Amino acid sequence: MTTQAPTFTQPLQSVVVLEGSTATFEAHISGFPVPEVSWFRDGQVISTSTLPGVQISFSDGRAKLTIPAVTKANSGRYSLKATNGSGQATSTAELLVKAETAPPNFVQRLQSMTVRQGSQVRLQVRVTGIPTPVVKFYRDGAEIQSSLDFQISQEGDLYSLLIAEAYPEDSGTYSVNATNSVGRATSTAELLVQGET
């Protein structure tokens, strides 16, 4: 073809990806003779010893680097350097790794109910959230840190308050709260215990 220093047809572009998913830096390059190409992260050279699982390819002009699954550790700016007789070109971009997160969700909300005195009552919610939300049960607005007949338990994302035998005085407004780093949610229901005789 002809003598020509390497130029990026398409420089590297920053990427934002979910932790544990694949990232990918791609560039189109030119130059003659074909440029010796190499990748760096935050200044230092990259290899599969440096970053187990890296797939780096250089052919037909296209210059890929793939991270099968990414980690927060992997975050930082990546460079592609192309050198030959006529000069050199460098393209830098950022790999930005986002942790997975999702606000508290009530897949199942508290629902109010009327029960007879003496009945067992189960007040249960289903709650998701990354990180796991802290959930708290409340009665007439004060926290039930659960002594005696008001056993709070968990079974996966199912949290249930148990009242073994229902007393009339137990009637009130129950509320469960769910919070974590990126949001909060609150579900309230009324319980009426209908006496006897």
Partner: protein
């Protein structure tokens, strides 16, 4: 530079069944990455020509209660994930 933090709320009142429900969450987050963050320089030592560029990019992270994330580079693509992320191999 100036990250923007956008929130979403829901608030619900059931009068029939005497139930109430509310929710506030960090929905969308927008940030600025420095110009050094993505740059190029090329030296043509045969012709004595050099080129340099640097440019900001704004990144978008969006999340939800139904475990769907959305992220990417403002002005380019978005990518959507279903949480918890469920790899393939």
């Amino acid at each position: 530079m100036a990250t923007s933090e956008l929130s979403s709320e829901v608030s619900e009142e059931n009068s029939e069944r005497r139930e109430a429900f509310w929710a506030e969450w960090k929905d969308l987050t927008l940030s600025t990455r420095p110009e050094e963050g993505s740059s190029l320089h090329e030296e043509d030592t045969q012709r004595h020509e050099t080129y340099h560029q640097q440019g900001q990019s704004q990144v978008l992270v969006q999340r939800s209660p139904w475990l769907m994330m959305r992220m990417g580079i403002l002005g380019r693509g978005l990518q959507e994930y279903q949480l918890p992320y469920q790899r393939v191999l």
